[PDB]
Design a protein around this ligand. Structure first.
Ligand SMILES: Cc1cc2nc3c(=O)[nH]c(=O)nc-3n(C[C@H](O)[C@H](O)[C@H](O)COP(=O)(O)OP(=O)(O)OC[C@H]3O[C@@H](n4cnc5c(N)ncnc54)[C@H](O)[C@@H]3O)c2cc1C
Ligand SMILES: Cc1cc2nc3c(=O)[nH]c(=O)nc-3n(C[C@H](O)[C@H](O)[C@H](O)COP(=O)(O)OP(=O)(O)OC[C@H]3O[C@@H](n4cnc5c(N)ncnc54)[C@H](O)[C@@H]3O)c2cc1C
Ligand SMILES: COc1cc2c(C)cc(=O)n(C)c2c(OC)c1OC
Ligand SMILES: COc1cc2c(C)cc(=O)n(C)c2c(OC)c1OC
Ligand SMILES: [Zn+2]
Ligand SMILES: [Zn+2]
Lengths: 230, 230
């Protein structure tokens, strides 16, 4: 205490189940006295494509464009597009980053994928070496709050979709752990469109209630064993 | 008569290793007499965001925007935006879809994620009950040709990145199998950047040689067992 939270939110419709989860998060964290910022990606028309427009200085190799090389250089030089550096400041200052989104093809919506591809650049979020437990965002927490079309039963080892933890791997491990975050347990709200009124109201209050005690949680062990079992 | 091939290609640089891989595919499949189309997403400045611009004329429910429902309705009512319907016509006609991209955060670059989100819509690629084995694209083949920054060893079950198959799950199972594709074994070119100009030539040649007998291949068993178990 005090703490800063950044909610990276990816939904088009403010009256949605995602919008309600993001709003109870802002309400609950604000009530506790935390500092809260929301990056509402669709509302910002956030640029998801990794292009040469993300660099505004002299290119290190202006004959063969390599996005990774040019963004890492631009980061050190401070010539990245300012939409990227606005996001990096929010992440740099945050103690906790919550990503709020509907599952799209077992992953994040593209607009949010583009935030991860463009904001978590080398130099800022990781270095080579300086990744996983040595990633540059070490000491920060991150949490996925995901909604699905598919039911909890569908997302079991024997269900048609495989276990829910399987689709978490690229995001929790390959992205967040890689940058050094400690990952808190995912919040997964299954199948709200199918749920009843009471069940949807229960899922919102469960999230709200879990946030009351978020600062007391331990991270998951972000390993293959946690994601896949043995 | 002959097969049709669609290459969805997601790299900013013509001279890159991705670009060479794409150009080998075009040349080899063209040599064989195949009908070949390339979707060069970055050259198309392809839109990755799922927004209400994806639907033309007036919305099914203009008070609460639900992207899934509205694009399903627009597909059935021939009211989708023409960047999406252009891609769908290329997919509908294809016998094989090859995706050629660098791995970004254990997944596809956001421009390519936005093509999957937007082009593979309900009523086109899947519905109730056409999903998994009965998905609407049954009978077509799909193939991921991925390049990585990480080495083959980093991508083992007990290596730092875990098994390559772990990241393949959301793309191969959650997306391509879900839509009914039969999925061919992925082509993975590990760590081209850490050379040599010989292993590089050799990875390119292997890809060109594999495309020679691409039509004789059997699809993988696209199962939790293939990705995760023994
Ligand atoms: C391109 C695409 C890909 C997808 N891929 C997958 C996938 O791979 N796997 C999968 O399982 N699903 C997938 N889906 C389905 C998607 O994940 C779900 O449709 C989404 O998670 C539901 O969240 P929502 O906020 O949009 O729900 P909504 O439709 O907005 O909400 C459902 C109901 O909850 C109501 N609601 C809003 N706020 C409250 C509140 N406070 N209290 C009670 N009710 C409230 C809404 O009014 C609505 O009636 C995909 C969808 C799309 C469009
Ligand atoms: C946002 C971001 C996220 C990333 N996430 C990951 C991740 O999760 N995991 C991971 O492993 N990696 C990741 N990477 C690294 C990325 O996957 C690799 O940089 C990429 O796959 C390399 O492919 P390329 O085509 O750009 O290589 P290039 O740099 O373009 O080429 C490699 C070498 O081969 C040369 N070459 C070109 N054509 C030929 C040819 N015809 N014959 C011989 N040589 C040729 C090139 O000139 C170059 O010297 C990430 C990168 C970025 C930018
Ligand atoms: C592609 O879109 C969707 C995909 C899925 C997938 C892959 C699995 C699943 O269980 N469900 C339930 C989905 C869903 O729910 C409704 C979608 O909604 C549009
Ligand atoms: C985000 O960018 C990158 C990410 C990775 C990840 C997640 C794993 C990995 O093994 N490597 C090798 C990466 C890499 O390679 C150099 C990147 O490029 C800068
Ligand atoms: Zn991990
Ligand atoms: Zn499968």
């Amino acid at each position: 205490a005090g703490k800063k939270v950044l909610i990276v939110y990816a939904h088009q419709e403010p009256k949605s189940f995602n919008g309600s989860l993001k709003n109870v998060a802002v309400d609950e964290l604000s009530r506790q006295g935390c500092t809260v910022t929301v990056s509402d990606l669709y509302a910002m028309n956030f640029e998801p494509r990794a292009t040469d427009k993300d660099i505004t200085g002299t290119l290190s190799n202006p004959e063969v464009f390599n996005y990774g090389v040019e963004t890492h250089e631009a980061y050190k030089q401070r010539s990245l597009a300012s939409d990227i550096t606005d996001e990096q400041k929010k992440v740099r200052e945050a103690d906790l980053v919550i990503f709020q989104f509907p599952l799209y093809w077992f992953s994040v919506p593209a607009i949010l994928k583009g935030w991860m591809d463009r904001v978590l650049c080398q130099g800022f979020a990781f270095d080579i070496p300086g990744f996983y437990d040595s990633g540059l965002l070490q000491g920060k927490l991150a949490l996925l709050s995901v909604t699905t079309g598919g039911t909890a039963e569908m997302y079991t080892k024997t269900g048609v979709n495989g276990d829910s933890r399987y689709f978490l791997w690229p995001l929790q491990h390959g992205t967040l752990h890689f940058c050094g975050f400690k990952v808190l347990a995912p919040q997964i709200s299954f199948a709200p469109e199918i749920a009843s009124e009471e069940e949807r109201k229960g899922m919102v209050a469960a999230w709200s209630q879990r946030l009351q005690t978020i600062w007391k949680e331990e991270p998951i062990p972000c390993t293959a064993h946690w994601h896949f079992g043995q």
